[PDB]
């Protein structure tokens, strides 16, 4: 009106998206022998 | 006079072990010398060197019966009649 017309603008930034994701460990496994003693 | 007997590990592990028992031999070589000694040595040693949980047994006449891990198990003869083994859990 009296400042001039202003300009529009537009600007938007960089969104990664959320993923959900779930792993897993296990417990190592043993061994359990027995033996006797030579001679 | 290392005479295997019985065999699990791999044969690094297995000329580090001759290592050390002859080591402990040396350690205690003398007619006052007691097995219980070099055991300790042995088992501290493979201890700092390969990690905890092992177990050296030295005898010439017995019986044992334990658990062990796998590759982780030796059990050997000596010309001077030392019945060595050792093992890991």
Same mark, same amino acid.
């Given at each position: ?15 990664? *998206? ?5 792993? *897993?460990?296990?417990?190592?496994? *043993? ?9 | 006079?290392? @005479? +295997? ?11 580090? /072990?001759?290592? %050390? @028992?002859?080591?402990? @031999?040396?350690?205690?070589? /003398?007619? %006052?010398?007691? +097995?219980? /000694?070099?055991?300790?040595? @042995?088992?501290?040693?493979?201890? &700092?060197? !390969? ?6 047994? +030295?005898?010439?006449?017995? /019986? $044992?019966? %334990?658990? =062990? ?5 030796? !059990?050997? !003869? $000596?010309?001077?009649?030392?019945? =060595?083994?050792? !093992? &890991?859990?």
């Amino acid at each position: 009106r009296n400042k001039f017309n202003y300009n529009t603008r537009e600007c938007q930034t960089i969104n990664p *998206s959320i993923r959900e994701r779930g792993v *897993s460990t296990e417990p190592p496994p *043993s061994d359990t022998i027995c033996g006797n003693i030579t001679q | 006079k290392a @005479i +295997i007997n019985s065999s699990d590990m791999q044969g690094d592990l297995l000329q580090e /072990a001759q290592d %050390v @028992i002859q080591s402990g @031999i040396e350690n205690n070589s /003398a007619p %006052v010398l007691n +097995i219980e /000694a070099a055991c300790k040595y @042995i088992k501290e040693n493979l201890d &700092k060197k !390969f990690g905890p949980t092992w177990q050296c047994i +030295i005898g010439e006449g017995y /019986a $044992y019966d %334990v658990t =062990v891990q796998n590759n982780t198990l030796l !059990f050997m !003869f $000596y010309n001077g009649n030392l019945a =060595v083994l050792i !093992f &890991k859990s």
